[PDB]
Design an enzyme around this catalytic site. Structure first.
Site, PDB file in Angstrom:
ATOM      1  N   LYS C  86      36.017  37.781  37.325  1.00  0.00           N
ATOM      2  CA  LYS C  86      36.747  38.302  35.879  1.00  0.00           C
ATOM      3  C   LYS C  86      36.085  37.225  34.618  1.00  0.00           C
ATOM      4  O   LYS C  86      36.301  37.726  33.812  1.00  0.00           O
ATOM      5  CB  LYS C  86      37.989  38.326  36.068  1.00  0.00           C
ATOM      6  CG  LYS C  86      38.679  39.077  36.871  1.00  0.00           C
ATOM      7  CD  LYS C  86      38.899  40.761  36.777  1.00  0.00           C
ATOM      8  CE  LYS C  86      40.589  41.252  37.204  1.00  0.00           C
ATOM      9  NZ  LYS C  86      39.795  42.619  37.226  1.00  0.00           N
ATOM     10  N   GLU C 108      46.226  41.113  29.533  1.00  0.00           N
ATOM     11  CA  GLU C 108      47.035  41.511  30.284  1.00  0.00           C
ATOM     12  C   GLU C 108      46.264  40.434  31.965  1.00  0.00           C
ATOM     13  O   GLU C 108      45.053  40.861  31.948  1.00  0.00           O
ATOM     14  CB  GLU C 108      47.269  42.684  30.752  1.00  0.00           C
ATOM     15  CG  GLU C 108      46.140  43.792  31.600  1.00  0.00           C
ATOM     16  CD  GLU C 108      44.529  43.313  31.290  1.00  0.00           C
ATOM     17  OE1 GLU C 108      44.436  43.730  29.746  1.00  0.00           O
ATOM     18  OE2 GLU C 108      43.631  43.843  31.413  1.00  0.00           O
ATOM     19  N   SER C 376      34.721  39.577  45.511  1.00  0.00           N
ATOM     20  CA  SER C 376      34.946  39.093  44.112  1.00  0.00           C
ATOM     21  C   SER C 376      36.003  38.139  43.310  1.00  0.00           C
ATOM     22  O   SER C 376      35.881  37.490  42.624  1.00  0.00           O
ATOM     23  CB  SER C 376      36.161  40.343  43.645  1.00  0.00           C
ATOM     24  OG  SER C 376      37.723  40.775  44.263  1.00  0.00           O
TER      25      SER C 376
END
Ligand SMILES: Cc1ncc(COP(=O)(O)O)c(C/N=C(\CNc2ccccc2O)C(=O)O)c1O
Ligand SMILES: Cc1ncc(COP(=O)(O)O)c(C/N=C(\CNc2ccccc2O)C(=O)O)c1O
Ligand SMILES: O=P(O)(O)OCCNS(=O)(=O)c1ccc(OC(F)(F)F)cc1
Ligand SMILES: O=P(O)(O)OCCNS(=O)(=O)c1ccc(OC(F)(F)F)cc1
Ligand SMILES: [Cl-]
Ligand SMILES: [Cl-]
Ligand SMILES: [Cl-]
Ligand SMILES: [Cl-]
Ligand SMILES: [Cl-]
Ligand SMILES: [Cl-]
Ligand SMILES: [Cl-]
Ligand SMILES: [Cl-]
Ligand SMILES: [Cl-]
Ligand SMILES: [Cl-]
Ligand SMILES: [Cl-]
Ligand SMILES: [Cl-]
Ligand SMILES: [Cl-]
Ligand SMILES: [Cl-]
Ligand SMILES: [Cl-]
Ligand SMILES: [Cl-]
Ligand SMILES: [Cl-]
Ligand SMILES: [Cl-]
Ligand SMILES: [Cl-]
Ligand SMILES: [Cl-]
Ligand SMILES: [Cl-]
Ligand SMILES: [Cl-]
Ligand SMILES: [Cs+]
Ligand SMILES: [Cs+]
Ligand SMILES: [Cs+]
Ligand SMILES: [Cs+]
Ligand SMILES: [Cs+]
Lengths: 395, 265, 395, 265
Positions: C86, C108, C376
């Protein structure tokens, strides 16, 4: 006899029961042989790069030096797999263990970063791993306790003494003295009996080697000083080693000041203790007038140790490296500063190194200086300890 | 070190080995410790191995760890131990007295000054548990200058170089280590080591680490060693009877009598 | 009108109230301009390398494929600063926000990894950051809640609806619709209204670009398949993008199966939902027969979302990419397998991707195949959730 | 859409604006909702804006969010709303009825089928809150084919292109958006927008988002707009009197009377 010098000036040696000397000589020859072995070095490099993620970034702080003439870089060992620099030398010691035909691993840990590193290397390379950790540290670094157990390691809480790192060290060595034909003792720092201070330095010296190349590329010159926290000595000697012969580069090691040196609740034997014999080595120790080993204190479990590695005692003695201390409160302020102004959550151990660099800047803000802080780990293991403090003081 | 020489001569002229109990000085208090040691000697102890309380006894399992703690709970310092040693020597002029030290307590105030104090109170030997022969030079030189015998460990798998070193460097007795590990009565000889030590003119051998029953004592003597040391089995009798001082002493005397008897061939 | 195509086949679009269209057009032109700007690209690259630590390692599993003809590599986004992929696109969006003169950030988060990334980039680059997070996720991912607050971000628990990601998404968009002249909405995945699906892909495509170069160097050929979990779509499209024109490379996206598809408690709308309009886009949705948006479920907060990004719906429709599901139990077994046999503690989201690769191997163990799993994130945020499970089932 | 045309003609021949309350259908139950709406119309509502309960009302603040929830708590489905709409139309043949939709409820069973059902029950207009003019083509084409007016939002800072688009695409009335943000009576005109819409032949303008007091109503009419919409102020009167159904209706009638009066110049 040994193949390599076990002393750094008067400090070091092999002060272990006679029963353990074959194990130490066995480890020394395996290391000397591995260091000459291209295949060992290629396997070690492969694990550093492709498993642990080396080279680690060298990050230039922007915000926290604004308005001063300090340029500050952070050597990002917090990004290494496992979250701290402890993983580097563990990979190398694990390959030495396999080279010796060992199948089990013993390790001590305080911040639990060496324990996590020992467990992950043992999972990867097929060793059975057991880890001693003080019961106090079980609590204030509990995220790492879960982590070690999730990777299949056995975690043994030690309730004697302070229930901190010294007692885990003692329990580890007691165990190895009766299991050394089958277990390798994966010592977690650049201390203990020879050859550990030497092996741990050589297996951490990529910290400083990368830093040198990175600084030369970005700044075209060497740093004015490199700064590292000192718990037992491994991340600091890993940062220092490649700069030792560059006599213009300052080497600054930072001991925990705890509640303040004057309270006696600290972890700064190099500057405030006196030479003694314990943990297999002749080194500065916190001790009573009678020679009993004193209990240390630090907010940071990883620094909460009443001794220090013998190469640091030697580098200090000749004046090549300088050592200072940083209190709990100063480390906490640097922790907050880094989170809020650079978006990096440092280990409280590394926060001591950062705090001293920020002092160097703030005390003399028009002094031109190029500094590197060894950011030895990330702070996820500390957020619960830090939160309970900030709530106790009304934040 | 002459007291060891004379004891082994007389044990030879009697066809028996030495039984050598170990206790930590000042466990559970100074006065009870002195009384314990007299009871050991009255029940037939040939020599003594005595521990000075140390904060971190690396070579000791939990039984003797707890002995060290009890002593510290009574405020026992190395200084008080030397006062005890002087009282023991004053009562017992021929009994060999050996100390079990950790290196920091010897190095702390000066190695020479430590051995000088040992000589002043009449100690005969000093074993420093975390000093191998490879680091022993300043300790054994200071020991000999003060007529203290330096005790060296012969471990189970020692090589020939170690055997020759230990033979030449040690005095008083050679410590024949039963096994790897730390002290304890919960974890239980090698005839080849006993005989190589004789060929090299080493001090006579005593076996220790794990000896807790008379059978083990008789086994060592039969193997040709000169005797045997028992620490933890002694210490647990202390631990179990802390609330009954004279039930403690009765049980100590009975145990030592049985261990001593087993050394008589 | 727009500068770029807002649709992927029938999927995508800009289904937002008219008031927000200028903000979206403003973001689109800034992106198009930044992509042509050498100085933007050099600044973005500098932050990726020297701050976040790119390139990330490509790790070859040894132990878990033993006895099969599967070769499995893990693309180590778990090593990125912040602990998950991210962070990549957040750095790029933060530079776009500064390029637009914005000074606040809305975001969010569900696993809290996007929130952590938004907070750290805002601390570094001088933005004020506020983050919506479902109250259920506040609890099962609480390590990240502390982390965001330590870096100066405001964290707002959302108690309406499921108290999971959908409700945090709704609250974020409600806020932006009344603060867009001064706040940039840092959307955390490759979904939402155009241009976000496009921007997020381009700012994550280094995952696949590095993977391609790394595989070619180590194996001399492309992978047989790359495999990624799909929560909203960002790490999967970042892994896929550079392989889309290599028609021999399989693209496999893994949706959460939750308690089992047949229970209806899952997060797999691409394969088990039906197209709908919500969160500003036309995309597969979990919905009632009447068109009410259904509540999703996954053990993993980061996958617990009742929709999916529109490029994945398109790649599926034409058959270029295949999508599967993995249940809670299967993800947990792959989590344990990775900890114990490779010494890496994966995020439970990434564990879904791993579980499917392990299925591909185990189902056909003599099939020769070269696989890459997008790892990830790391699993530190999950260890407390995982521990309470293993204790509930008696372990 | 003819009902809007006729209402604005008569409001013109009376020198007054329109007051248009908003409620969610079925809040707090179907029977009370129908009764509420009749009370709104009896107290002087010129037209209605009616919300169909949606699971995720993106453009609505907490007051109208809670209206949606109450309806769902009464089991209110879109199907039941269409039965309510038919009952309202049957009682009130000339009152313009406008729906506030979210796009998924229009798209769900087929856009054309949605507008066909609207025509069957006598709905006059449909505003889809999350469909901008840029995505509106299939919605406004289906609306017009079923004689439904598509309502478009004119936002505060619209450019000229938007003004011309909204003028050409909309029918019935133009929605003059008071401000950014979401609906609510807690967060409180632009004359230039009102006049550009007239030049381009747009449908007449009603202002909404934040109108909660008679003064705001009079302000809109004076600015040259044709009227004003109030949702949250209406809804809170419902929320506050859930336990007193007829105290609710008395307070609703009083409030609407005051708001309607303010539209009379
Ligand atoms: C992030 C981080 N940064 C710095 C340090 C300080 O250790 P140093 O770099 O070796 O000086 C630690 C120390 N960590 C220990 C103590 N390790 C330890 C300390 C002292 C004696 C034995 C030990 O095993 C551990 O067990 O994890 C750390 O976690
Ligand atoms: C380690 C890791 N790995 C994979 C994922 C899945 O996300 P993906 O790569 O975008 O598919 C996550 C999802 N994380 C979210 C949800 N982020 C999110 C998900 C769906 C809609 C909006 C969102 O902000 C977060 O907020 O941190 C994650 O943390
Ligand atoms: O009978 P046990 O198991 O209690 O052992 C009693 C041992 N007491 S001692 O003084 O001889 C003794 C001797 C040597 C020791 O360590 C060393 F070998 F490393 F030097 C420790 C204690
Ligand atoms: O008076 P308030 O603050 O309660 O506002 C009442 C609004 N009710 S409504 O049907 O007109 C209405 C109109 C448009 C909406 O969203 C959009 F602008 F994006 F299209 C939402 C509600
Ligand atoms: Cl020396
Ligand atoms: Cl080398
Ligand atoms: Cl070499
Ligand atoms: Cl070089
Ligand atoms: Cl340069
Ligand atoms: Cl003091
Ligand atoms: Cl002193
Ligand atoms: Cl200092
Ligand atoms: Cl200067
Ligand atoms: Cl006697
Ligand atoms: Cl001799
Ligand atoms: Cl289209
Ligand atoms: Cl580009
Ligand atoms: Cl370019
Ligand atoms: Cl290329
Ligand atoms: Cl190749
Ligand atoms: Cl179902
Ligand atoms: Cl349907
Ligand atoms: Cl499937
Ligand atoms: Cl095959
Ligand atoms: Cl009326
Ligand atoms: Cl018109
Ligand atoms: Cs790297
Ligand atoms: Cs500066
Ligand atoms: Cs220390
Ligand atoms: Cs394989
Ligand atoms: Cs999903």
């Amino acid at each position: 006899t040994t193949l390599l010098n076990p002393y750094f000036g008067e400090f070091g040696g092999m002060y272990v029961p006679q029963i353990l000397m074959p194990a130490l000589n066995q480890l020394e020859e395996a290391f000397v042989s591995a260091q000459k072995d291209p295949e060992f070095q290629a396997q070690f490099a492969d694990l550093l790069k492709n498993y642990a993620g080396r080279p680690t970034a060298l990050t230039k702080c922007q915000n926290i030096t604004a308005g001063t003439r300090t340029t500050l870089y952070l050597k990002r060992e917090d990004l290494l797999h496992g979250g701290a620099h402890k993983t580097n030398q563990v990979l190398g010691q694990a390959l030495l263990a396999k080279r010796m035909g060992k199948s089990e691993i013993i390790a001590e840990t305080g911040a639990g970063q060496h324990g996590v590193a020992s467990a992950l290397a043992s999972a990867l390379l097929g060793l059975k791993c057991r880890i001693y950790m003080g019961a106090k540290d079980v609590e204030r670094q509990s995220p790492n306790v879960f982590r070690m157990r999730l990777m299949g390691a056995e975690v043994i809480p030690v309730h004697s003494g302070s229930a901190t790192l010294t007692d885990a060290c003692n329990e580890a060595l007691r165990d190895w003295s009766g299991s050394y034909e089958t277990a390798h003792y994966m010592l977690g720092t650049a201390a203990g009996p020879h050859p550990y201070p030497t092996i741990v330095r050589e297996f951490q010296r990529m910290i400083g080697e990368e830093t040198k190349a990175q600084i030369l590329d970005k700044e075209g010159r060497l740093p004015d000083a490199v700064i590292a926290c000192v718990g037992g000595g491994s991340n600091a000697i890993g940062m220092f080693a490649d700069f030792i012969n560059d006599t213009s580069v300052g080497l600054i090691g930072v001991e925990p000041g705890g509640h303040g040196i004057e309270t006696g609740e600290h972890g700064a034997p190099l500057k405030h203790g006196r030479v003694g014999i314990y943990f297999g080595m002749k080194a500065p120790m916190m001790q009573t007038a009678d020679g009993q080993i004193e209990e240390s204190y630090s907010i940071s479990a990883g620094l909460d140790f009443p001794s220090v590695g013998p190469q640091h005692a030697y580098l200090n003695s000749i004046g090549r490296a300088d050592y200072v201390s940083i209190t709990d409160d100063e480390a906490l302020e640097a922790f907050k500063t880094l989170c809020r102004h650079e978006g990096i959550i440092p280990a409280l151990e590394s926060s001591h190194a950062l705090a001293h660099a920020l002092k160097m800047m703030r005390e003399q803000p028009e002094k031109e200086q190029l500094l590197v802080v060894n950011l030895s780990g990330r702070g996820d293991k500390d957020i619960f300890t830090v939160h309970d403090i900030l709530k106790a003081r009304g934040e | 070190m002459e007291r060891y020489e004379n004891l082994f001569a007389q044990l030879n002229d009697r066809r028996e080995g030495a039984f050598v109990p170990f206790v930590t000085l000042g466990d559970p208090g100074i006065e009870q410790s002195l009384k314990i040691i007299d009871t050991l000697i009255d029940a037939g102890a040939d020599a003594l191995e005595l521990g000075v309380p140390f904060s971190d006894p690396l070579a000791d399992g939990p039984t003797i760890q707890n002995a060290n703690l009890r002593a510290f709970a009574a405020g026992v310092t190395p200084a008080q131990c030397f006062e005890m040693l002087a009282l023991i020597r004053e009562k017992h002029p021929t009994i060999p007295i050996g100390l079990l030290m950790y290196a920091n307590l010897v190095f702390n105030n000066g190695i020479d000054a430590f051995y000088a104090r040992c000589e002043q109170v009449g100690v005969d030997s000093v074993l420093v548990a975390d000093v191998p022969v490879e680091e022993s030079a300043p300790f054994r030189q200071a020991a000999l200058r003060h007529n203290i015998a330096p005790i060296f460990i012969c471990p189970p798998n020692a090589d020939d170089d170690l055997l020759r070193q230990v033979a030449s460097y040690g005095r008083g007795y050679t410590y024949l280590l039963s096994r790897s590990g730390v002290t304890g009565a919960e974890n239980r000889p090698l005839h080849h080591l006993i005989e190589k030590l004789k060929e090299y003119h080493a001090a006579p051998a005593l076996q220790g680490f794990g000896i807790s029953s008379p059978e083990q004592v008789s086994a060592a003597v039969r193997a040709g060693a000169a005797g045997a040391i028992s620490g933890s089995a002694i210490v647990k009798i202390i631990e179990k009877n802390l609330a009954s001082p004279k039930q403690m002493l009765a049980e100590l005397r009975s145990f030592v009598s049985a261990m001593k008897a087993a050394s008589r061939a």
